Amino acid sequence: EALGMIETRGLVALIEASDAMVKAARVKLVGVKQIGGGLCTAMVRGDVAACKAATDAGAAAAQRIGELVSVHVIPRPHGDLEEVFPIGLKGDSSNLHH
Amino acid sequence: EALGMIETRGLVALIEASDAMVKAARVKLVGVKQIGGGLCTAMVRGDVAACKAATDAGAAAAQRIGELVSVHVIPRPHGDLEEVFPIGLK
Amino acid sequence: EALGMIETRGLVALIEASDAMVKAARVKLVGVKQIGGGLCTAMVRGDVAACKAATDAGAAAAQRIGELVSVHVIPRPHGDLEEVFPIGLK
Amino acid sequence: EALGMIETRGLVALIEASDAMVKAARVKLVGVKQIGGGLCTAMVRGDVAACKAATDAGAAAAQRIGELVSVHVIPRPHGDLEEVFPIGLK
Amino acid sequence: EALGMIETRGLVALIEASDAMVKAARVKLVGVKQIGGGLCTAMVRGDVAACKAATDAGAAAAQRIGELVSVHVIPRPHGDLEEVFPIGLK
Amino acid sequence: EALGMIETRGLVALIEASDAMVKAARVKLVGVKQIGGGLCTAMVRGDVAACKAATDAGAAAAQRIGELVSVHVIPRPHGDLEEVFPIGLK
Structure with missing residues (x-):
């Protein structure tokens, strides 16, 4: 699967993009991370051509x-x-051990 | 059922907003947040119209x-x- | 009971204003939360006016x-x- | 009964500060603290005047x-x- | 073995580097620390020749x-x- | 024994200097630390001139x-x- 992500400085801007992304195309939202500075990133997996479109609309709603x-x-x-x-879905490493 | 939020630099702005928000319409405050930075965000969920009111009050109240x-x-x-x-009701 | 609160950019100013705050008048220091950012904030609760006196003086001494x-x-x-x-009493 | 503080942007400017404070006078370094933005505060307790010499010396060593x-x-x-x-003595 | 690293402002640039690093050559991606103002750093380890091929490609693609x-x-x-x-092999 | 330290802004920079630092004179890297804004420090102890030379090399390597x-x-x-x-050896 493809990796799509957008990073924003400003959370609210982040959530909105995450919303439009997962709305745009067939892509799941395998989580988000922030790293200080107000910078914070959301990430999605999907069909390559899905993650392409989602990010695209993500960047939009974000700007x-x-x-x-x-x-x-x-x-x-x-x-x-x-x-x-x-960047992970839960491959159930731990819930995979049983 | 809907989700409104506002992002500040300044905790004291964020708390004032929250207060105008709930106090402005029928919307429960479900999360505060931070992203390092001095930036942090507050969350609410209610009727579409509810959230637009409180969002409107908070943005202003923090302005x-x-x-x-x-x-x-x-x-x-x-x-x-x-x-x-x-973003949820727990 | 009312809520007073000050916010600065530097812990020293901060512990300083809180000290006036609590010294100014009839109020109790009840929380301090940091946003990192170098922004930090204190909280106290008295009878509304006790939070005005209290704040007013706190911002002073802070500045x-x-x-x-x-x-x-x-x-x-x-x-x-x-x-x-x-912000809670405890 | 005397509480001296120093606040720096930079740790090594603060580890110096404290080192000179404890050294200058008879005040007891009761804790460091950091609050994002690379700001942080060193705290010391002693004889009122002893906090004055120690601050004056440590501030100066950081400048x-x-x-x-x-x-x-x-x-x-x-x-x-x-x-x-x-600031607790511990 | 050798150790190469890249440091970025931005997690995205960072994630791209690593990906182009682990691709560019014979290197194992062993770490990512992180600090304030969104600087995050990425570790890898291999043939010194190989940590070059990689840092070069990872530097670029972030650029x-x-x-x-x-x-x-x-x-x-x-x-x-x-x-x-x-840095260590875990 | 003494204390050499060399603070940065940027981790990668801080790594090269801990390396060379420990590579210059005989000294022990006792530990590191960040405090936000992406400033951070390394800290070593050793025979006092050990630290003079080591700090001094880490500073160049870093610059x-x-x-x-x-x-x-x-x-x-x-x-x-x-x-x-x-600061201690543990």
């Missing part, structure tokens, strides 16, 4: 209400990019 | 005692939203 | 110690505000 | 190393301050 | 997606570095 | 990858500093 800084998509997430980023 | 950043209401939050954001 | 962001008071803090901000 | 933002001292802190502020 | 604040590889970090920084 | 806030040495840390700062 409208707040300060959007960056948006980007990644058709080919590195496998091991996960054990390190909230 | 006066500090920095306002953002107001918005989302009439019909996508379900996915809630599992991620502090 | 000499440096950078102050907000002062404000709310005589009748909406009820469910308590359950979301460190 | 050389870097970013100094606050130096104050309260000879007679309310008791409310202890239970909320980390 | 276009946002704010890069530093690239560097250390061929042979001291053993100390290990016990005080997220 | 280049990124931005350096503070270097300093305090040959004779007041024993008190140590129960409040990540």
